[PDB]
Structure formats: structure tokens, C-alpha cells
Assembly symmetry: none
Homo-oligomer: 38 residues x 3
């Protein structure tokens, strides 16, 4: 099960970094929005 524990870890890290990339994109979006509105 060290092979499962290991893919559990690989899936967790893919998920964590997607959430970081998602947040970064949100911030970019919100600044396109500032520029467009203000």
C-alpha cells in the first residue's frame, strides 16, 4: 500500500498546485476587470 499511499500523495500535489494556479488566474481576471471598469 506504499504504492497507493504514493499515488494518494501524487494526486494531492496535483490538486494543491491546480488550486494555486486557479487562484492566480482569478487574480489576473480581477485585474483585467479593474482596468475595464475603472
Amino acid at each position: 500500500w506504499g504504492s497507493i499511499d504514493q499515488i494518494n500523495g501524487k494526486m494531492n500535489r496535483v490538486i494543491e498546485k491546480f488550486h494555486q494556479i486557479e487562484k492566480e488566474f482569478s487574480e489576473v481576471e480581477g485585474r483585467i476587470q479593474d482596468m475595464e471598469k475603472y
Copy 2:
């Protein structure tokens, strides 16, 4: 262990939807 497959099917859940989000 039932415990690490328990997790897997759970972690695998969030992974699958992110697949979709990707």
C-alpha cells in the same frame, strides 16, 4: 489497508473533477 483505499477513492474524487476543471 482499507484505510489507504478509503482515502484513495476519496482523494481520487476531487482529482476527477479537477480533471474536468482542467
Copy 3:
């Protein structure tokens, strides 16, 4: 100002999206293979 800044940030975000795609495909592949064999 804010225009070249967004342009830089967005390009770097897109770069990081392409990295995460490849990593996902590789993790998925490994899960598929564990389940198949």
C-alpha cells in the same frame, strides 16, 4: 502600467496551466495502469 503587467501575469499563468495538464495526465496514467494490471 497595469496593461503590460496583466500581460506578463497572464502569460505566466498560461505556462503554469500547461505544466499542470501534463502532470495530471501522468498521475492519471499511473492510476489507470495500477487499476488495469
